[PDB]
Write a protein that binds this ligand. Structure first.
Ligand SMILES: O=C(O)CNC(=O)C(=O)O
Ligand SMILES: [Cl-]
Ligand SMILES: [Fe+3]
Length: 365
């Protein structure tokens, strides 16, 4: 009998496996140093661990905040997605019910909540994402507060994982980057770099009928183990393929964002996830819409480069090329139908595309 991912035996095997340490890959950085300058210099191509929250501008409740507290501020009747780790299947249930299980003295099942976005609850005011995320985020910067399309609801997640919880290898939707803060307990990440072959292997693995029977890390050269302890915050870059294991009961907060340093990888991940057709519950809503607003921003910046005679940085110009390629593919008449639903009000795609194309020609010279 083949071992299924998430099963009791798998977890035992996994705990015994040795992995290269995240030491050579994950930078340890003090919160006050994680600046926009730092991101630009290093380019956010590898995860970053911030051992203490000081300097991050991160707002979170004290460690004396419990799952019972989440129930109160979120709402006991609130429906939630619950993952049965051993089956590797998802279901729905009231939060009060999950909480009743969580506090059970003899849990039979291994169940977690890893999709609870609480920006629309009373608990929202208790959590504020790190300053660096707000500075990098496309939605935070370029999506108007008066927009008719609702902003992607991906900014404040509460994760509750019991001991022995496992989340299998995945790339986050939209190739989005993540901040992940452990309030109580600890969370182990197994991190795989999005080198081109690795992404291709991931796509082939995720699309295979027997994928829940195969340990993905067996197929790549390096899978790095990174333990994130209480009070620590991990920043995961675009496109990284990762799984997690929960060694002790864990409560954590996280958010997802897109940014200008990984336009290429963001599109690549999006293309992969579109080919996979997972119809996820964790999909990045209105990813295309965020790209459209980025596109309008770039056109404005280019126009602004003509008033100063100061050219845009090369990564933006390249970002423009990649986005403009997307806009074209999304609006070819053979395509409109499904993609038009994400177009913001008052956008004229064929004009934007032509204006961006011209501006890029001029920038190149
Ligand atoms: O909490 C976990 O173990 C898994 N979390 C996620 O993959 C995430 O927040 O995007
Ligand atoms: Cl964003
Ligand atoms: Fe994830």
């Amino acid at each position: 009998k083949p071992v299924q991912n998430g099963s009791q035996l798998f977890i035992k095997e996994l705990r015994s496996r040795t992995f290269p340490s995240a030491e050579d890959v994950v930078a340890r950085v003090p919160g006050s140093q994680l600046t926009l300058g730092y991101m630009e210099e290093h380019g956010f191509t590898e995860p970053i661990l911030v051992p203490k929250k000081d300097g991050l501008g991160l707002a979170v409740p004290a460690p004396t905040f419990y799952v019972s507290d989440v129930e109160n501020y979120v709402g006991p009747e609130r429906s939630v997605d619950v993952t049965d780790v051993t089956k590797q299947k998802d279901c729905k249930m009231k939060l009060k019910e999950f909480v009743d299980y969580y506090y059970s003295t003899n849990r039979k099942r291994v169940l977690n909540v890893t999709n609870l976005e609480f920006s629309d609850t009373r608990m929202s005011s208790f959590v504020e994402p790190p300053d660096i995320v707000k500075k990098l985020s496309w939605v935070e910067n370029y999506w108007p507060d008066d927009a008719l399309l609702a902003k992607p609801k991906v900014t404040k997640y509460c994760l509750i994982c019991v001991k022995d919880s496992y989340t299998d290898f995945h790339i986050d939707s939209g190739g989005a980057s993540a901040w992940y803060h452990v309030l109580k307990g600890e969370k182990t990440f197994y991190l795989i770099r999005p080198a081109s072959a690795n992404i291709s292997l991931y796509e082939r693995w995720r699309s295979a009928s027997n994928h829940s029977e195969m340990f993905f890390a067996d197929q790549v050269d390096k899978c790095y183990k990174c333990i994130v302890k209480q009070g620590q915050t991990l920043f995961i870059p675009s496109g990284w393929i990762y799984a997690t294991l929960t060694p002790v009961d864990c409560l954590a907060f996280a958010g997802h964002f897109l940014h200008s340093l990984s336009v290429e990888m963001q599109m690549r991940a999006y293309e992969v996830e579109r080919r996979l057709k997972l119809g996820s519950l964790t999909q990045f809503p209105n990813f295309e819409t965020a790209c459209w607003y980025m596109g309008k921003h770039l056109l404005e910046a280019f126009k602004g480069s003509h008033k100063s005679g100061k050219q845009l940085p090369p990564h933006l110009v390249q970002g423009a090329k990649i986005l403009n390629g997307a806009f074209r593919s999304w609006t070819k008449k053979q395509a409109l139908a499904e993609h038009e639903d994400e177009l913001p009000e008052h956008f004229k795609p064929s004009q934007l595309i032509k204006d961006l194309a011209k501006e890029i020609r001029l920038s190149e010279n």
